[PDB]
Amino acid sequence: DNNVVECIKEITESSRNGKLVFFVGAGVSTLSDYPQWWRLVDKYHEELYGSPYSSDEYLRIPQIFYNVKGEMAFDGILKDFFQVDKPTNPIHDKILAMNPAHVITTNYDNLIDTACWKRGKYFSVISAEEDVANATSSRYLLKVHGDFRKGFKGENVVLKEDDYLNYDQNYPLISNLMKTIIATHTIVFIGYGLGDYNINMLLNWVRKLQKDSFHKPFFIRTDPSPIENETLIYYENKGLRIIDAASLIDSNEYDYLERYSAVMDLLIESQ
Amino acid sequence: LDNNVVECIKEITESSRNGKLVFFVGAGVSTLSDYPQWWRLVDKYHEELYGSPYSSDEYLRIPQIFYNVKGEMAFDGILKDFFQVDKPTNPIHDKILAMNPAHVITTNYDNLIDTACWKRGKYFSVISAEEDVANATSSRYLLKVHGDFRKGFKGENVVLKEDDYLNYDQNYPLISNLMKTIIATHTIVFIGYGLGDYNINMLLNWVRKLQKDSFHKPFFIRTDPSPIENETLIYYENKGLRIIDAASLIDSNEYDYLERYSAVMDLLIESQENKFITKDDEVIDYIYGKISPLFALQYIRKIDLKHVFE
Amino acid sequence: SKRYGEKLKEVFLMLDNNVVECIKEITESSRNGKLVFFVGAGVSTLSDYPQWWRLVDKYHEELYGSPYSSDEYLRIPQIFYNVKGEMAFDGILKDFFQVDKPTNPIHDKILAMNPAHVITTNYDNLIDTACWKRGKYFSVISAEEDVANATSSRYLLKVHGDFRKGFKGENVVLKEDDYLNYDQNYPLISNLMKTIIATHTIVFIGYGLGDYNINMLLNWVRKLQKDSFHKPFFIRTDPSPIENETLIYYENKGLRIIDAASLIDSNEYDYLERYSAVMDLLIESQENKFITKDDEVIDYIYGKISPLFALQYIRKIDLKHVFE
Amino acid sequence: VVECIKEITESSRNGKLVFFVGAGVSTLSDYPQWWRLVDKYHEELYGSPYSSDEYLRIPQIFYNVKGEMAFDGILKDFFQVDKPTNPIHDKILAMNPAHVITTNYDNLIDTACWKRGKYFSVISAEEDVANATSSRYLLKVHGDFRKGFKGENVVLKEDDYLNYDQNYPLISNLMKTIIATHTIVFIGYGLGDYNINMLLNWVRKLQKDSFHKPFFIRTDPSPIENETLIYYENKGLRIIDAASLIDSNEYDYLERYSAVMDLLIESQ
């Protein structure tokens, strides 16, 4: 399609200019069989009531466990679930081969960190409040939701309902830096859904901005069904340029890896 | 019943006697009157937007998409053809009114509470728009925080779509301020809510910002078919709620919500005259509560003592 | 006394139409019981309560050894609080404010206007004492916890705290930190103030047009829907008459200004006379000292009697209650 | 002071230095101050010629009662002047700042950058943030008159500072990001300035140690009192006072600015 062709043209232009920034979601980590959050909520529910989900439950049940079962058990469950070493899927390699100026990720894993270490491109990893000031390099691997580098504790990561409720207060520098990077760069979203919490919050923040004062970020959709035209136009009017990998080619209902690979290697071959 | 349940009943009835009881009525009470639920409206919006038929955020986003795409006129038409119905008032409406509440705050955009107030003989200043706050004719309000269809069956008169909830504080500053003031200054009982409702959690989030003990914990009449889990009960009671579970009080069928609501409502009403006196200590406590203020006076006329004990 | 009454009558006779309508609206609110008074520091000053500029003077004296913009009045107390301790701040508060001052006649006039509520930025107990003498009970709300347990329907809402608990800097809104964190620290107080403003008729007395509280309230008012609220009345008692440009600017912001200096002639430092001019105009409007022609008599008696046309017979003992 | 110079010079060598230039340097360049603008607005308002909010309220009153046309006319007839750049601008450029944040709406810093040959991406509107083509930034947080001598292009009166975050979210975000990620030296600002107070209020929201303490060059004629100094050290500002460094005249601000600028430059 002409719109799609213009899209990959503009991401290739931004990548050549060095103004390209990649926004990484949970799908990229899940592609490497990382422990998903739904199973963490399932374990919290099993330790809460003994028998194992809406959008609100995903944030509430961890908060219920944190409140009634304390924080030591929360940290123990997080440690036993997330203290794993997983190989980097080719999607990380293709993202880094696109030469992104910044990598803003909501994932709390170190997959992007090890991928960057292997690829030889040094990214200043900023995941805590103190990391903003003492940034060694210009390129930022910005984990807006924190990570487990300090330790496998829930205080370092944005997981529960309280963490999302108080994110602006607890992470003013991280949120400010991420908004600045979005404003002054071209943003490409992978590993996210159209109904994702962070995606819709970012759409709200964009709606607060002045019209035509920002570049519309790119959203890459790997949902199995092709994107509905009504949903597509609704989200494009909200400030998104959607590249649907499901519309690009036909694939199975469970093969997400090839779906990400289609857009990634199409972008690379355009470059 | 349980001791804490009896304490909740005592507090609610004392507030009702003092004229400081406010009822926060949700969609559950209207649903028992067969008023169309919002999931049918989202079903229709999905039917028009897509081929054929959700998440909690979808219930607001799908109408938002229908608005943004098909037009305010189409949204208006579907709202008009779905909500322009006449439904009877529940006995629960009459029970709430018989509790003599100071105010009735409600997220219901129907006039079922209005019809109940008009039938029973209660005069409430119905505040459903911003201009109604200053034009209220009395100090007792029927506060529809999400608007209604009195002006017309228009989508701008109510809080339905996603954009309505995001811009609620901006679009309803007087109504929101009045609701929070009523919550702060009165005793609040939540009825018709599912303990996971958006409004309940927004009010609990606002309650978090308040001082540690500057507010009274609102009551929550939970009428879910199954008894509340203990961990959920601790979580919500540590958030500032005092939960009275209809399922724990009596046993009934899963789909028999009318009896679940009526158990708690009739237990509250029948407790209005009840003094909860069984032991001699309770007798002494009640008589002391009646008599101790008279210790200031040197003598009391014996014919005046009939007024002390009502 | 009689000369003052005659002068007030004359002033009402040549009063501007706008001021006459404002007075009529305020009196109608008073009769309806929907009148709320927003009392400022000026009314407390009329009884010679210690003003805040002397407190800033003492703070500057202890800070730099020598004896003010708008920011200074809030920063210098904050300078004292940060550089020195809280104990010294509370001690200065105690020595300046632990005084028993009388209630000026303006207090009596305000309570004679039958206010449903009295909001005030004054941390003194002058208004509480004034309400106590007149036999009407006002639930005094000066802290967060006081909001939930409010005994009566009428509130005396001290939005900046007071010293009933003690002469401490944590009980009152004085320094710059208090104003920065007022919304966080006083959610219930601010919400109750805004609800009272929305639901009642507000008259600002004792305030300057450029006061911080007035500007904050006008900033909140701008957020409200157009024509969804009633414009508060503002009794301006500055020595000089209000400029036309300032008047139109503040009336477009949602204020109905009754300027005392424009109504009567008075000395520059005769503040009590300026306050009394407007308050007495309101009261003698309530007391019907200003009706003289047979048309006003008919309208007054009709307003008292026309509702009784609904009934068939009215007891002569009831007619006494009808005419108060 | 010696330690303060070491940090400034070290960060200047690292290339992450940023200067927050106030109205003081523009005044040193004899630019029309805002107080005379307020005086002109008052004269055209009341007819006879100040509180902290007066500087914001009086232009707002004039805009409300007279209209946008008269406001912009006064702005144009008072600001459309050519003023040579003072040597302090050249010294600031010679410190090689990574970015220059200015509350000034003039082109004095822009003209200095053009004269010296340094390319800074001048941002004063919302659209300038996204379309900036250089890593270096000249962030005019209050706007300027490059588009035109209009009141909408600048933040001058009340209802412009009140709605600053609503109309300048991108610019405010960029300013805060630059402050967080770089070291900041305030020059041409008073300690009681509104912008300094706003930035200190925002900094108080940040958690402890997460931010670099901004540097404040004070050029008032009288030496700072120890109590006010310690108060503003606690607030987060590291203050270097020109009055304490050398003995200077009451109205000789240029030598006061130079006593800090040349000392900082020669310590490279």
Give chain C's end-to-end CA distance (angstroms, integer). 24
Sheet of strand B219-222: strand arrangement: B125-127, B141-144, B103-106, B21-25, B187-191, B219-222, B242-245
Q: Which chains touch B (3 or more CB pairs under 8 A)?
A: A, C
Question: DSSP code of A227?
Answer: P
Cβ density class C241-255: b for 16+ within 10 Å, e for less: ebeebbbebbeebbb
Q: Which chains touch A (3 or more CB pairs under 8 A)?
A: B, D
**Inter-residue contact C75 to D194 (CB < 8 Å):** no
Q: Determine whether the interchain pair C75/D192 forms a contact, defined as Cβ–Cβ distance below 8 Å.
A: yes
Alpha helices in A19-89 (DSSP H): 26-31, 37-49, 55-68, 72-82
- Whether chain C lies against chain A with 3 or more Cβ pairs closer than 8 A is no
> C233 is written with which tokens?
């009345």
Closest by Cα among D89, D98, D183 to D137? D98
Resolution of the structure, angstroms: 2.5
Residues of A whose CB is below 8 A from D180: 132-133, 173, 176-177
Q: Is the dihedral of CA B83, B87, B91, B93 positive or negative?
A: positive
**Inter-residue contact B261 to B92 (CB < 8 Å):** yes
Q: In angstroms, rounded to a whole number, what is the distance separating the alpha carbons of residues D117 and A31?
A: 50
Residue of C35, C191, C222 best to disrupt the B interface, most CBs of B under 10 A: C191
Closest by Cα among A214, A142, A211 to A173? A142
Q: In angstroms, rounded to a whole number, what is the distance separating the alpha carbons of residues D236 and D180?
A: 13
User: Considering only alpha carbons, which residue of chain D is nearest residue C65?
Assistant: D225
C257 backbone dihedrals φ, ψ, rounded to 5°: -90, 125
Q: In angstroms, rounded to a whole number, what is the distance separating the alpha carbons of residues A253 and D162?
A: 52
Let me know if B109 is a catalytic residue. Answer: yes
Q: In angstroms, rounded to a whole number, what is the distance separating the alpha carbons of residues C36 and C48?
A: 24
Would you mind telling me the total number of residues written for chain A in this entry? 271
Closest by Cα among A254, A139, A194, A257 to A265? A257
Residues whose CB falls within 8 Å of the CB of residue A5, separated by 6 or more in sequence, listed in order:
none
Of A55, A228, A231, the CB nearest to B56: A55
DSSP H or E stretch at residue D228: helix D226-235
Q: In angstroms, rounded to a whole number, what is the distance separating the alpha carbons of residues B203 and B302?
A: 49
Q: In angstroms, rounded to a whole number, what is the distance separating the alpha carbons of residues A2 and A11?
A: 14
Closest by Cα among A220, A218, A216 to A191? A220
Residue C232 CA to its chain's centroid (Å):
11
Measured from the Cβ of residue B10, the count of other Cβ atoms closer than 10 Å reads: 14
- C144 part of contact set with chain B, CB < 8 Å: yes
- C87 part of contact set with chain D, CB < 8 Å: no
Q: After which residues is chain D broken (C to N over 2.5 A)?
A: 49
Q: What is the CA radius of gyration of chain D?
A: 18
Residues whose CB falls within 8 Å of the CB of residue B185, separated by 6 or more in sequence, listed in order:
B20, C147, C148, C150, C192
Q: In angstroms, rounded to a whole number, what is the distance separating the alpha carbons of residues B35 and B24?
A: 18
- C68 part of contact set with chain D, CB < 8 Å: no
Measured from the Cβ of residue A239, the count of other Cβ atoms closer than 10 Å reads: 18
The residue type of B134 is: A
Q: In angstroms, rounded to a whole number, what is the distance separating the alpha carbons of residues A41 and A96?
A: 31
Q: Which long-range contacts (CB under 8 A, 24 or more apart) does D11-14 make?
A: D11/D182, D11/D183, D12/D95, D12/D96, D12/D97, D12/D268, D13/D268
The residue type of A137 is: S
Beta strands in D141-255, from DSSP E residues, in sequence order: 183-187, 215-218, 238-241
**Inter-residue contact C55 to C92 (CB < 8 Å):** yes
Measured from the Cβ of residue B52, the count of other Cβ atoms closer than 10 Å reads: 6
Among all residues of A, which ones are annotated catalytic? 108-109, 145
- A153 part of contact set with chain B, CB < 8 Å: no
What is the dihedral angle through the alpha carbons of A233, A237, A240, A244, rounded to the nearest 10 degrees?
A: 0
- Whether chain C lies against chain B with 3 or more Cβ pairs closer than 8 A is yes
Q: In angstroms, rounded to a whole number, what is the distance separating the alpha carbons of residues A254 and A238?
A: 29
Q: Beta strand A241-244 with A218-221: parallel, antiparallel or unpaired?
A: parallel
Distance from CA of B7 to the nearest CA of C (A): 19
Helix D87-94 crosses helix D253-266 at what angle (to 10 degrees)?
Answer: 20
**Inter-residue contact D129 to D170 (CB < 8 Å):** yes
DSSP H or E stretch at residue A117: helix A111-119
**Inter-residue contact B116 to B93 (CB < 8 Å):** yes
Q: Beta strand B125-127 with B21-25: parallel, antiparallel or unpaired?
A: unpaired
Q: Determine whether the interchain pair C188/B211 forms a contact, defined as Cβ–Cβ distance below 8 Å.
A: yes
Residue D173 CA to its chain's centroid (Å):
17
Alpha helices in B167-293 (DSSP H): 168-171, 173-185, 198-209, 230-237, 246-249, 257-270, 280-291
Closest by Cα among D110, D141, D171, D118 to A184? D171
Task: Return the SS3 of D102.
Answer: strand
Task: Map tokens 């990077």 to a residue.
Answer: A181
Question: DSSP code of D84?
Answer: P
Alpha helices in D131-168 (DSSP H): 164-167
Q: What is the 3-state secondary structure (H, E, C) of chain C?
A: CHHHHHHHHHHHHCCCHHHHHHHHHHHHHHHHCCEEEEECHHHHHCCCCCCHHHHHHHHHHHHHCCCCCCCHHHHHHHHHHHHCCHHHHHHHHHHHHCCCCCCCHHHHHHHHCCCCEEEECCCCCHHHHHHHHHCCCCEEECCCHHHHCCCCCCEEEECCECCCCCCCCCCECCCHHHHHCHHHHCHHHHHHHHHHHHHCEEEEECCCCCCHHHHHHHHHHHHCCCCCCCCCEEEECCCCCCCHHHHHHHHHCCCEEEEHHHHCCCCCCCHHHHHHHHHHHHHHHHCCCCCCCHHHHHHHHHHHHHHHHHCCCCCHHHHHHHCC
Residues whose CB falls within 8 Å of the CB of residue C211, separated by 6 or more in sequence, listed in order:
C40
Q: In angstroms, rounded to a whole number, what is the distance separating the alpha carbons of residues B215 and D232?
A: 37
Alpha helices in D23-67 (DSSP H): 23-28, 34-45, 54-66
CA atoms within 13 A on the CB side of B227: 8
D154 backbone dihedrals φ, ψ, rounded to 5°: -130, 160
Structure method? cryo-EM
Q: Determine whether the interchain pair D205/A172 forms a contact, defined as Cβ–Cβ distance below 8 Å.
A: yes
**Inter-residue contact C269 to C21 (CB < 8 Å):** no
Let me know if C124 is a catalytic residue. Answer: yes
Residues whose CB falls within 8 Å of the CB of residue D163, separated by 6 or more in sequence, listed in order:
none
DSSP H or E stretch at residue D259: helix D253-266
Q: In angstroms, rounded to a whole number, what is the distance separating the alpha carbons of residues C150 and C156?
A: 10
Cβ density class C61-83: b for 16+ within 10 Å, e for less: ebbeeeeeeebbbbbbbbbbbbb
**Inter-residue contact D215 to D179 (CB < 8 Å):** no
Residues whose CB falls within 8 Å of the CB of residue B39, separated by 6 or more in sequence, listed in order:
B54, B59
Q: Which chains touch D (3 or more CB pairs under 8 A)?
A: A, C
Sheet of strand C35-39: strand arrangement: C139-141, C155-158, C117-120, C35-39, C201-205, C233-236, C256-259
Q: In angstroms, rounded to a whole number, what is the distance separating the alpha carbons of residues D91 and D258?
A: 8
Task: Return the SS3 of A112.
Answer: helix
Helix A90-97 crosses helix A111-119 at what angle (to 10 degrees)?
Answer: 60
Q: In angstroms, rounded to a whole number, what is the distance separating the alpha carbons of residues B53 and A216?
A: 30
User: In sequence order, what are the beta bridge partners of B23?
Assistant: B104, B189
Q: In angstroms, rounded to a whole number, what is the distance separating the alpha carbons of residues D79 and D72?
A: 10
Q: In angstroms, rounded to a whole number, what is the distance separating the alpha carbons of residues D87 and C6?
A: 71
Residues of A whose CB is below 8 A from B232: 64
- C75 part of contact set with chain D, CB < 8 Å: yes
**Inter-residue contact B46 to B65 (CB < 8 Å):** no
User: Considering only alpha carbons, which residue of chain A is nearest residue B235?
Assistant: A64
> A32 is written with which tokens?
């490497």
Residue of C29, C225, C229, C231 best to disrupt the B interface, most CBs of B under 10 A: C225
Residue D136 CA to its chain's centroid (Å):
17
- B68 part of contact set with chain C, CB < 8 Å: no
Helix D226-235 crosses helix D194-205 at what angle (to 10 degrees)?
Answer: 50
Q: In angstroms, rounded to a whole number, what is the distance separating the alpha carbons of residues B185 and C165?
A: 21
DSSP H or E stretch at residue A268: helix A256-270
Q: How many CB pairs under 8 A join C and D?
A: 46
Residues whose CB falls within 8 Å of the CB of residue B270, separated by 6 or more in sequence, listed in order:
none
Q: Beta strand C256-259 with D99-102: parallel, antiparallel or unpaired?
A: unpaired
Q: In angstroms, rounded to a whole number, what is the distance separating the alpha carbons of residues C41 and C124?
A: 10
214-233 of B, contacting C, C-beta below 8 A: 214-216
> B145 is written with which tokens?
């925080």
The residue type of B92 is: I
- C182 part of contact set with chain B, CB < 8 Å: no
Q: Determine whether the interchain pair D207/A129 forms a contact, defined as Cβ–Cβ distance below 8 Å.
A: yes
D89 backbone dihedrals φ, ψ, rounded to 5°: -60, -45
Residues whose CB falls within 8 Å of the CB of residue C221, separated by 6 or more in sequence, listed in order:
C229, C253, C254
List C-alpha distances in Å: A64 to A73, A159, C265.
12, 12, 69
Closest by Cα among A144, A157, A231, A164 to A193? A231
Question: DSSP code of B215?
Answer: S
Q: Determine whether the interchain pair A68/B231 forms a contact, defined as Cβ–Cβ distance below 8 Å.
A: yes
Question: DSSP code of B85?
Answer: -
